[PDB]
Amino acid sequence: MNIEKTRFCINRKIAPGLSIEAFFRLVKRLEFNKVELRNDMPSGSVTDDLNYNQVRNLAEKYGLEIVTINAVYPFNQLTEEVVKKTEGLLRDAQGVGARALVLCPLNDGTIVPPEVTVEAIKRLSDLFARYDIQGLVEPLGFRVSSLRSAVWAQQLIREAGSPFKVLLDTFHHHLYEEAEKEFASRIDISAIGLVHLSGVEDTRPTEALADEQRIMLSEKDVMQNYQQVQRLENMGYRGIYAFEPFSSQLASWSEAEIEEQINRSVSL
Ligand SMILES: [Zn+2]
């Protein structure tokens, strides 16, 4: 297996400690060219205390692409409150020159009918076009997720007639029983426009693991990061990979610890 390095993205959630400057100067210095900004770090702001300029220039200086902002939730349950909140994020992404905003389904045990997610996808595609932002729909694995399958979400994006793509997240994939030898032919790598990697070394049962159980990559993470990435490659994927580990263990890691466990990960 070989994959081109320039194809690697560093999701900020990996670095809750660092300021954006701090976070940027890192990456670049750590090699690569793509990041993800997020609206769920301590600041609660895609820019922390900054403004669009400061950030934008900070991406220029370190020659980085802001690939996505995570995330809009619940994109699916698209009340006027949610619409106003989404608009926020589009202003953010347009503001920092992000290319995508990440869309997360309702994740609370409530059914969101396919017809409604299909409407929410129509309405968000208008609203995105309005800010010239791309969309990425991230199915969530959990039994309580109102959209679990990357296949189904492609089905529903095709139906809304949307240029949006799916965000394949290794954990959420892992966490969803009916894919792998039901995936493969059913899935369409054309329309996967981002892949979020994170590893789960933990011996617990899959059937109720969480965002907290996500460290980085290395031999015996019970998630098939290689075997997913092997297949994604086998299949045509020439798009981005991003490290989006969550877990409280991203709490150690000097600016130099993060530097290395990114490299454990990139096993090749
Ligand atoms: Zn993700």
PDB file of C-alpha atoms and ligand atoms in Angstrom:
ATOM      1  CA  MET A   1       0.000   0.000   0.000  1.00  0.00           C
ATOM      2  CA  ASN A   2       1.113   3.576  -0.975  1.00  0.00           C
ATOM      3  CA  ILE A   3      -0.936   6.814  -0.729  1.00  0.00           C
ATOM      4  CA  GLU A   4       0.350  10.282  -1.537  1.00  0.00           C
ATOM      5  CA  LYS A   5       0.941  12.223   1.804  1.00  0.00           C
ATOM      6  CA  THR A   6      -0.517  15.395   0.294  1.00  0.00           C
ATOM      7  CA  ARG A   7      -3.664  13.262   0.740  1.00  0.00           C
ATOM      8  CA  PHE A   8      -3.572  13.608   4.501  1.00  0.00           C
ATOM      9  CA  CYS A   9      -5.651  15.818   6.702  1.00  0.00           C
ATOM     10  CA  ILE A  10      -5.306  16.710  10.356  1.00  0.00           C
ATOM     11  CA  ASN A  11      -8.570  17.296  12.120  1.00  0.00           C
ATOM     12  CA  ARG A  12      -8.231  19.853  14.942  1.00  0.00           C
ATOM     13  CA  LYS A  13     -10.065  17.640  17.514  1.00  0.00           C
ATOM     14  CA  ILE A  14      -6.543  15.924  17.756  1.00  0.00           C
ATOM     15  CA  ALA A  15      -5.259  19.068  19.451  1.00  0.00           C
ATOM     16  CA  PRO A  16      -7.637  20.565  21.903  1.00  0.00           C
ATOM     17  CA  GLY A  17      -4.707  22.321  23.671  1.00  0.00           C
ATOM     18  CA  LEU A  18      -3.237  24.316  20.762  1.00  0.00           C
ATOM     19  CA  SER A  19      -4.290  27.776  19.547  1.00  0.00           C
ATOM     20  CA  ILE A  20      -4.992  27.860  15.784  1.00  0.00           C
ATOM     21  CA  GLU A  21      -1.698  29.530  15.076  1.00  0.00           C
ATOM     22  CA  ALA A  22      -0.157  26.886  17.424  1.00  0.00           C
ATOM     23  CA  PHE A  23      -2.246  24.176  15.695  1.00  0.00           C
ATOM     24  CA  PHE A  24      -1.278  25.455  12.194  1.00  0.00           C
ATOM     25  CA  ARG A  25       2.491  26.017  12.801  1.00  0.00           C
ATOM     26  CA  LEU A  26       2.408  22.449  13.937  1.00  0.00           C
ATOM     27  CA  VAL A  27       1.028  20.801  10.714  1.00  0.00           C
ATOM     28  CA  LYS A  28       3.253  22.024   7.817  1.00  0.00           C
ATOM     29  CA  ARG A  29       6.073  21.707  10.338  1.00  0.00           C
ATOM     30  CA  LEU A  30       4.699  18.154  10.774  1.00  0.00           C
ATOM     31  CA  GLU A  31       4.730  17.839   6.895  1.00  0.00           C
ATOM     32  CA  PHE A  32       1.113  18.107   5.516  1.00  0.00           C
ATOM     33  CA  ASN A  33      -1.263  20.562   3.766  1.00  0.00           C
ATOM     34  CA  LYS A  34      -4.883  20.016   4.838  1.00  0.00           C
ATOM     35  CA  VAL A  35      -6.816  20.713   8.070  1.00  0.00           C
ATOM     36  CA  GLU A  36     -10.292  20.552   9.547  1.00  0.00           C
ATOM     37  CA  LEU A  37     -11.590  23.381  11.715  1.00  0.00           C
ATOM     38  CA  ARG A  38     -14.401  22.674  14.289  1.00  0.00           C
ATOM     39  CA  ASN A  39     -17.175  24.437  16.148  1.00  0.00           C
ATOM     40  CA  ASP A  40     -16.871  22.088  19.227  1.00  0.00           C
ATOM     41  CA  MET A  41     -13.462  22.844  20.871  1.00  0.00           C
ATOM     42  CA  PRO A  42     -13.119  24.790  24.152  1.00  0.00           C
ATOM     43  CA  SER A  43     -13.846  28.062  22.402  1.00  0.00           C
ATOM     44  CA  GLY A  44     -17.075  26.837  20.821  1.00  0.00           C
ATOM     45  CA  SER A  45     -16.026  28.921  17.810  1.00  0.00           C
ATOM     46  CA  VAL A  46     -14.609  27.876  14.508  1.00  0.00           C
ATOM     47  CA  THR A  47     -12.078  30.735  14.783  1.00  0.00           C
ATOM     48  CA  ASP A  48     -11.775  30.762  18.621  1.00  0.00           C
ATOM     49  CA  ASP A  49     -11.465  34.459  19.629  1.00  0.00           C
ATOM     50  CA  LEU A  50     -10.114  35.272  16.078  1.00  0.00           C
ATOM     51  CA  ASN A  51     -11.791  36.808  13.009  1.00  0.00           C
ATOM     52  CA  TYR A  52     -11.925  35.472   9.445  1.00  0.00           C
ATOM     53  CA  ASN A  53      -8.900  37.441   8.335  1.00  0.00           C
ATOM     54  CA  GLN A  54      -6.537  36.324  11.086  1.00  0.00           C
ATOM     55  CA  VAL A  55      -7.351  32.687  10.461  1.00  0.00           C
ATOM     56  CA  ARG A  56      -7.388  33.045   6.683  1.00  0.00           C
ATOM     57  CA  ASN A  57      -3.925  34.592   6.679  1.00  0.00           C
ATOM     58  CA  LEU A  58      -2.828  31.945   9.157  1.00  0.00           C
ATOM     59  CA  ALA A  59      -3.831  29.358   6.608  1.00  0.00           C
ATOM     60  CA  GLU A  60      -1.901  31.286   3.885  1.00  0.00           C
ATOM     61  CA  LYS A  61       1.284  31.528   6.067  1.00  0.00           C
ATOM     62  CA  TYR A  62       1.396  27.761   6.706  1.00  0.00           C
ATOM     63  CA  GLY A  63       0.175  27.048   3.228  1.00  0.00           C
ATOM     64  CA  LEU A  64      -2.745  24.944   4.534  1.00  0.00           C
ATOM     65  CA  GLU A  65      -6.168  24.040   2.984  1.00  0.00           C
ATOM     66  CA  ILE A  66      -9.062  24.184   5.508  1.00  0.00           C
ATOM     67  CA  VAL A  67     -10.806  21.126   3.991  1.00  0.00           C
ATOM     68  CA  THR A  68     -13.967  21.125   6.313  1.00  0.00           C
ATOM     69  CA  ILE A  69     -15.690  22.544   9.314  1.00  0.00           C
ATOM     70  CA  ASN A  70     -17.200  19.978  11.763  1.00  0.00           C
ATOM     71  CA  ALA A  71     -20.086  20.262  12.113  1.00  0.00           C
ATOM     72  CA  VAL A  72     -23.780  21.013  11.728  1.00  0.00           C
ATOM     73  CA  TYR A  73     -25.972  18.915  14.044  1.00  0.00           C
ATOM     74  CA  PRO A  74     -28.693  17.740  13.656  1.00  0.00           C
ATOM     75  CA  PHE A  75     -28.753  18.603   9.976  1.00  0.00           C
ATOM     76  CA  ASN A  76     -31.607  16.276   9.496  1.00  0.00           C
ATOM     77  CA  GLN A  77     -33.913  17.983  11.961  1.00  0.00           C
ATOM     78  CA  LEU A  78     -33.875  21.254  10.249  1.00  0.00           C
ATOM     79  CA  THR A  79     -35.894  23.702  12.372  1.00  0.00           C
ATOM     80  CA  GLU A  80     -35.456  27.493  11.798  1.00  0.00           C
ATOM     81  CA  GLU A  81     -33.094  27.478  14.853  1.00  0.00           C
ATOM     82  CA  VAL A  82     -30.947  24.892  13.119  1.00  0.00           C
ATOM     83  CA  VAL A  83     -31.181  26.846   9.856  1.00  0.00           C
ATOM     84  CA  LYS A  84     -29.886  30.006  11.591  1.00  0.00           C
ATOM     85  CA  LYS A  85     -27.130  27.915  13.281  1.00  0.00           C
ATOM     86  CA  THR A  86     -26.155  26.303   9.901  1.00  0.00           C
ATOM     87  CA  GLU A  87     -26.032  29.789   8.321  1.00  0.00           C
ATOM     88  CA  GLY A  88     -23.437  30.604  11.110  1.00  0.00           C
ATOM     89  CA  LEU A  89     -21.328  27.794  10.075  1.00  0.00           C
ATOM     90  CA  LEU A  90     -21.516  28.771   6.362  1.00  0.00           C
ATOM     91  CA  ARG A  91     -20.485  32.280   7.230  1.00  0.00           C
ATOM     92  CA  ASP A  92     -17.587  30.615   9.158  1.00  0.00           C
ATOM     93  CA  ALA A  93     -16.568  28.374   6.337  1.00  0.00           C
ATOM     94  CA  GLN A  94     -16.928  31.031   3.685  1.00  0.00           C
ATOM     95  CA  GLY A  95     -15.042  33.346   6.077  1.00  0.00           C
ATOM     96  CA  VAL A  96     -11.962  31.065   6.531  1.00  0.00           C
ATOM     97  CA  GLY A  97     -12.038  29.616   3.076  1.00  0.00           C
ATOM     98  CA  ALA A  98     -13.157  26.133   4.265  1.00  0.00           C
ATOM     99  CA  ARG A  99     -14.372  24.021   1.371  1.00  0.00           C
ATOM    100  CA  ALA A 100     -16.956  21.976   3.296  1.00  0.00           C
ATOM    101  CA  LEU A 101     -19.204  21.902   6.271  1.00  0.00           C
ATOM    102  CA  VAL A 102     -19.880  18.566   7.841  1.00  0.00           C
ATOM    103  CA  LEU A 103     -23.426  17.516   8.366  1.00  0.00           C
ATOM    104  CA  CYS A 104     -24.338  15.186  11.251  1.00  0.00           C
ATOM    105  CA  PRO A 105     -27.795  13.377  11.533  1.00  0.00           C
ATOM    106  CA  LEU A 106     -30.030  13.584  14.610  1.00  0.00           C
ATOM    107  CA  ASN A 107     -28.584  11.197  17.136  1.00  0.00           C
ATOM    108  CA  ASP A 108     -31.133  10.698  19.892  1.00  0.00           C
ATOM    109  CA  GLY A 109     -33.332   7.651  19.222  1.00  0.00           C
ATOM    110  CA  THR A 110     -35.942   9.663  17.235  1.00  0.00           C
ATOM    111  CA  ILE A 111     -36.740   8.524  13.756  1.00  0.00           C
ATOM    112  CA  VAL A 112     -35.984  11.007  11.095  1.00  0.00           C
ATOM    113  CA  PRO A 113     -37.902   9.671   8.086  1.00  0.00           C
ATOM    114  CA  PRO A 114     -35.931   9.270   4.849  1.00  0.00           C
ATOM    115  CA  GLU A 115     -38.353  11.698   3.165  1.00  0.00           C
ATOM    116  CA  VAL A 116     -37.370  14.379   5.724  1.00  0.00           C
ATOM    117  CA  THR A 117     -33.616  13.844   5.485  1.00  0.00           C
ATOM    118  CA  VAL A 118     -34.108  13.989   1.662  1.00  0.00           C
ATOM    119  CA  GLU A 119     -35.927  17.399   2.165  1.00  0.00           C
ATOM    120  CA  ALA A 120     -33.279  18.604   4.609  1.00  0.00           C
ATOM    121  CA  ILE A 121     -30.676  17.696   2.035  1.00  0.00           C
ATOM    122  CA  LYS A 122     -32.523  19.728  -0.666  1.00  0.00           C
ATOM    123  CA  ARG A 123     -32.920  22.731   1.532  1.00  0.00           C
ATOM    124  CA  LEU A 124     -29.262  22.600   2.710  1.00  0.00           C
ATOM    125  CA  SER A 125     -28.006  22.245  -0.758  1.00  0.00           C
ATOM    126  CA  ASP A 126     -29.708  25.551  -1.654  1.00  0.00           C
ATOM    127  CA  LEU A 127     -28.466  27.199   1.356  1.00  0.00           C
ATOM    128  CA  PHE A 128     -24.941  25.956   0.887  1.00  0.00           C
ATOM    129  CA  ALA A 129     -24.823  27.100  -2.805  1.00  0.00           C
ATOM    130  CA  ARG A 130     -25.526  30.547  -1.364  1.00  0.00           C
ATOM    131  CA  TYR A 131     -22.103  30.515   0.398  1.00  0.00           C
ATOM    132  CA  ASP A 132     -20.312  28.378  -2.112  1.00  0.00           C
ATOM    133  CA  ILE A 133     -19.628  25.695   0.530  1.00  0.00           C
ATOM    134  CA  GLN A 134     -19.665  21.872  -0.157  1.00  0.00           C
ATOM    135  CA  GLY A 135     -21.570  19.503   2.077  1.00  0.00           C
ATOM    136  CA  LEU A 136     -20.525  16.254   3.629  1.00  0.00           C
ATOM    137  CA  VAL A 137     -23.015  13.971   5.247  1.00  0.00           C
ATOM    138  CA  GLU A 138     -21.528  11.811   8.051  1.00  0.00           C
ATOM    139  CA  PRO A 139     -23.575   8.871   8.966  1.00  0.00           C
ATOM    140  CA  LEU A 140     -23.171   8.148  12.758  1.00  0.00           C
ATOM    141  CA  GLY A 141     -22.908   4.483  13.746  1.00  0.00           C
ATOM    142  CA  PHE A 142     -24.740   4.435  17.083  1.00  0.00           C
ATOM    143  CA  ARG A 143     -27.947   2.475  17.407  1.00  0.00           C
ATOM    144  CA  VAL A 144     -29.587   5.875  18.243  1.00  0.00           C
ATOM    145  CA  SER A 145     -28.379   7.581  15.030  1.00  0.00           C
ATOM    146  CA  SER A 146     -31.222   8.593  12.703  1.00  0.00           C
ATOM    147  CA  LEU A 147     -29.005   7.880   9.664  1.00  0.00           C
ATOM    148  CA  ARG A 148     -26.652   4.963  10.110  1.00  0.00           C
ATOM    149  CA  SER A 149     -25.569   3.737   6.676  1.00  0.00           C
ATOM    150  CA  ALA A 150     -23.178   5.375   4.184  1.00  0.00           C
ATOM    151  CA  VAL A 151     -25.043   3.457   1.393  1.00  0.00           C
ATOM    152  CA  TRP A 152     -28.398   4.769   2.463  1.00  0.00           C
ATOM    153  CA  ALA A 153     -27.115   8.336   2.776  1.00  0.00           C
ATOM    154  CA  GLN A 154     -25.774   8.034  -0.811  1.00  0.00           C
ATOM    155  CA  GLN A 155     -29.209   6.752  -1.842  1.00  0.00           C
ATOM    156  CA  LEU A 156     -30.791   9.798  -0.174  1.00  0.00           C
ATOM    157  CA  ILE A 157     -28.319  12.303  -1.550  1.00  0.00           C
ATOM    158  CA  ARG A 158     -28.949  10.960  -5.069  1.00  0.00           C
ATOM    159  CA  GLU A 159     -32.592  11.410  -4.479  1.00  0.00           C
ATOM    160  CA  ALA A 160     -32.366  14.982  -3.319  1.00  0.00           C
ATOM    161  CA  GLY A 161     -30.296  15.438  -6.442  1.00  0.00           C
ATOM    162  CA  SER A 162     -27.541  17.015  -4.322  1.00  0.00           C
ATOM    163  CA  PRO A 163     -23.878  17.619  -5.082  1.00  0.00           C
ATOM    164  CA  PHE A 164     -23.244  16.754  -1.352  1.00  0.00           C
ATOM    165  CA  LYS A 165     -21.087  13.738  -0.550  1.00  0.00           C
ATOM    166  CA  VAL A 166     -20.795  11.239   2.286  1.00  0.00           C
ATOM    167  CA  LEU A 167     -18.152  11.549   4.980  1.00  0.00           C
ATOM    168  CA  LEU A 168     -16.936   7.995   5.753  1.00  0.00           C
ATOM    169  CA  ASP A 169     -15.872   7.855   9.364  1.00  0.00           C
ATOM    170  CA  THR A 170     -14.058   4.631  10.246  1.00  0.00           C
ATOM    171  CA  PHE A 171     -15.600   4.288  13.638  1.00  0.00           C
ATOM    172  CA  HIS A 172     -19.130   4.955  12.499  1.00  0.00           C
ATOM    173  CA  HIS A 173     -18.612   2.515   9.704  1.00  0.00           C
ATOM    174  CA  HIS A 174     -17.138  -0.018  12.135  1.00  0.00           C
ATOM    175  CA  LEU A 175     -20.027   0.558  14.446  1.00  0.00           C
ATOM    176  CA  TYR A 176     -22.658  -0.375  11.889  1.00  0.00           C
ATOM    177  CA  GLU A 177     -23.284  -4.044  11.439  1.00  0.00           C
ATOM    178  CA  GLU A 178     -24.570  -4.358   7.836  1.00  0.00           C
ATOM    179  CA  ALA A 179     -21.635  -3.174   5.724  1.00  0.00           C
ATOM    180  CA  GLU A 180     -18.467  -5.161   4.651  1.00  0.00           C
ATOM    181  CA  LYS A 181     -19.529  -7.948   2.153  1.00  0.00           C
ATOM    182  CA  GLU A 182     -22.824  -5.924   1.704  1.00  0.00           C
ATOM    183  CA  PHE A 183     -20.806  -2.700   1.306  1.00  0.00           C
ATOM    184  CA  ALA A 184     -18.211  -2.821  -1.583  1.00  0.00           C
ATOM    185  CA  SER A 185     -20.475  -3.037  -4.603  1.00  0.00           C
ATOM    186  CA  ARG A 186     -23.323  -1.119  -2.940  1.00  0.00           C
ATOM    187  CA  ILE A 187     -21.036   1.861  -2.240  1.00  0.00           C
ATOM    188  CA  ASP A 188     -19.871   4.596  -4.624  1.00  0.00           C
ATOM    189  CA  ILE A 189     -16.453   6.085  -4.094  1.00  0.00           C
ATOM    190  CA  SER A 190     -17.108   8.829  -6.576  1.00  0.00           C
ATOM    191  CA  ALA A 191     -19.412  10.295  -3.827  1.00  0.00           C
ATOM    192  CA  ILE A 192     -17.262   9.756  -0.754  1.00  0.00           C
ATOM    193  CA  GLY A 193     -15.626  13.118  -0.472  1.00  0.00           C
ATOM    194  CA  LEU A 194     -13.819  12.718   2.866  1.00  0.00           C
ATOM    195  CA  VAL A 195     -12.624   9.943   5.152  1.00  0.00           C
ATOM    196  CA  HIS A 196     -12.139  10.362   8.823  1.00  0.00           C
ATOM    197  CA  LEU A 197      -9.712   7.928  10.412  1.00  0.00           C
ATOM    198  CA  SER A 198      -9.314   7.188  14.110  1.00  0.00           C
ATOM    199  CA  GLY A 199      -8.322   3.949  15.869  1.00  0.00           C
ATOM    200  CA  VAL A 200      -9.905   2.050  18.805  1.00  0.00           C
ATOM    201  CA  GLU A 201      -7.280  -0.235  20.515  1.00  0.00           C
ATOM    202  CA  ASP A 202      -9.894  -0.922  23.378  1.00  0.00           C
ATOM    203  CA  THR A 203     -11.051  -4.558  23.984  1.00  0.00           C
ATOM    204  CA  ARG A 204     -14.715  -3.504  24.930  1.00  0.00           C
ATOM    205  CA  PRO A 205     -17.692  -4.593  22.823  1.00  0.00           C
ATOM    206  CA  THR A 206     -18.304  -2.625  19.579  1.00  0.00           C
ATOM    207  CA  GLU A 207     -22.111  -2.833  20.099  1.00  0.00           C
ATOM    208  CA  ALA A 208     -21.917   0.010  22.709  1.00  0.00           C
ATOM    209  CA  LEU A 209     -18.502   1.859  22.353  1.00  0.00           C
ATOM    210  CA  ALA A 210     -18.228   5.738  22.065  1.00  0.00           C
ATOM    211  CA  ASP A 211     -16.489   8.939  20.721  1.00  0.00           C
ATOM    212  CA  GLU A 212     -14.354   8.730  23.994  1.00  0.00           C
ATOM    213  CA  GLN A 213     -12.814   5.329  22.971  1.00  0.00           C
ATOM    214  CA  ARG A 214     -11.050   6.880  19.888  1.00  0.00           C
ATOM    215  CA  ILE A 215      -7.236   7.191  20.139  1.00  0.00           C
ATOM    216  CA  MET A 216      -4.984   7.389  16.994  1.00  0.00           C
ATOM    217  CA  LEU A 217      -3.592   4.602  14.676  1.00  0.00           C
ATOM    218  CA  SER A 218      -1.413   1.432  15.241  1.00  0.00           C
ATOM    219  CA  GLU A 219      -1.287  -2.380  15.039  1.00  0.00           C
ATOM    220  CA  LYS A 220      -4.239  -3.900  16.971  1.00  0.00           C
ATOM    221  CA  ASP A 221      -6.697  -1.082  16.834  1.00  0.00           C
ATOM    222  CA  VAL A 222      -9.736  -3.362  16.638  1.00  0.00           C
ATOM    223  CA  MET A 223     -10.943  -1.009  13.797  1.00  0.00           C
ATOM    224  CA  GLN A 224      -9.741  -2.130  10.351  1.00  0.00           C
ATOM    225  CA  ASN A 225      -8.057   1.186   9.499  1.00  0.00           C
ATOM    226  CA  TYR A 226      -5.630  -0.559   7.114  1.00  0.00           C
ATOM    227  CA  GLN A 227      -8.333  -2.981   5.788  1.00  0.00           C
ATOM    228  CA  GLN A 228     -10.761  -0.089   5.275  1.00  0.00           C
ATOM    229  CA  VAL A 229      -8.100   2.108   3.812  1.00  0.00           C
ATOM    230  CA  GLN A 230      -6.756  -0.866   1.810  1.00  0.00           C
ATOM    231  CA  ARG A 231     -10.182  -1.333   0.270  1.00  0.00           C
ATOM    232  CA  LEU A 232     -10.860   2.386  -0.171  1.00  0.00           C
ATOM    233  CA  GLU A 233      -7.695   2.478  -2.181  1.00  0.00           C
ATOM    234  CA  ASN A 234      -8.335  -0.772  -4.039  1.00  0.00           C
ATOM    235  CA  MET A 235     -11.606   0.887  -5.056  1.00  0.00           C
ATOM    236  CA  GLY A 236     -10.548   4.216  -6.494  1.00  0.00           C
ATOM    237  CA  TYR A 237     -10.389   6.643  -3.543  1.00  0.00           C
ATOM    238  CA  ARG A 238      -8.098   9.523  -4.496  1.00  0.00           C
ATOM    239  CA  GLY A 239      -9.662  11.814  -1.907  1.00  0.00           C
ATOM    240  CA  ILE A 240      -8.573  13.053   1.539  1.00  0.00           C
ATOM    241  CA  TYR A 241      -7.833  11.101   4.751  1.00  0.00           C
ATOM    242  CA  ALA A 242      -8.127  12.883   8.079  1.00  0.00           C
ATOM    243  CA  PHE A 243      -7.275  11.992  11.568  1.00  0.00           C
ATOM    244  CA  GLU A 244     -10.238  12.631  13.730  1.00  0.00           C
ATOM    245  CA  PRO A 245      -9.543  10.870  16.998  1.00  0.00           C
ATOM    246  CA  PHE A 246     -11.692  12.097  19.973  1.00  0.00           C
ATOM    247  CA  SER A 247     -11.043  10.399  23.402  1.00  0.00           C
ATOM    248  CA  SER A 248      -9.681  12.141  26.565  1.00  0.00           C
ATOM    249  CA  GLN A 249      -6.192  10.764  25.736  1.00  0.00           C
ATOM    250  CA  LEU A 250      -5.672  13.609  23.205  1.00  0.00           C
ATOM    251  CA  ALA A 251      -5.173  15.291  26.681  1.00  0.00           C
ATOM    252  CA  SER A 252      -1.505  14.169  27.139  1.00  0.00           C
ATOM    253  CA  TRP A 253       0.587  14.838  23.956  1.00  0.00           C
ATOM    254  CA  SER A 254       2.877  17.798  23.917  1.00  0.00           C
ATOM    255  CA  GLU A 255       2.950  19.646  20.552  1.00  0.00           C
ATOM    256  CA  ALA A 256       5.583  16.963  20.049  1.00  0.00           C
ATOM    257  CA  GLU A 257       3.487  14.009  21.264  1.00  0.00           C
ATOM    258  CA  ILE A 258       0.684  14.698  18.770  1.00  0.00           C
ATOM    259  CA  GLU A 259       3.539  15.131  16.249  1.00  0.00           C
ATOM    260  CA  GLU A 260       4.509  11.428  16.631  1.00  0.00           C
ATOM    261  CA  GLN A 261       1.178   9.438  17.107  1.00  0.00           C
ATOM    262  CA  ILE A 262       0.199  10.926  13.755  1.00  0.00           C
ATOM    263  CA  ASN A 263       3.020   8.643  12.493  1.00  0.00           C
ATOM    264  CA  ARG A 264       2.325   5.456  14.276  1.00  0.00           C
ATOM    265  CA  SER A 265      -0.737   6.335  12.077  1.00  0.00           C
ATOM    266  CA  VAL A 266       0.519   6.510   8.407  1.00  0.00           C
ATOM    267  CA  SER A 267       1.673   2.985   9.039  1.00  0.00           C
ATOM    268  CA  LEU A 268       2.238   3.470   5.190  1.00  0.00           C
TER     269      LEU A 268
HETATM  270 ZN    ZN B   1     -15.894  12.064  11.767  1.00  0.00          ZN
END
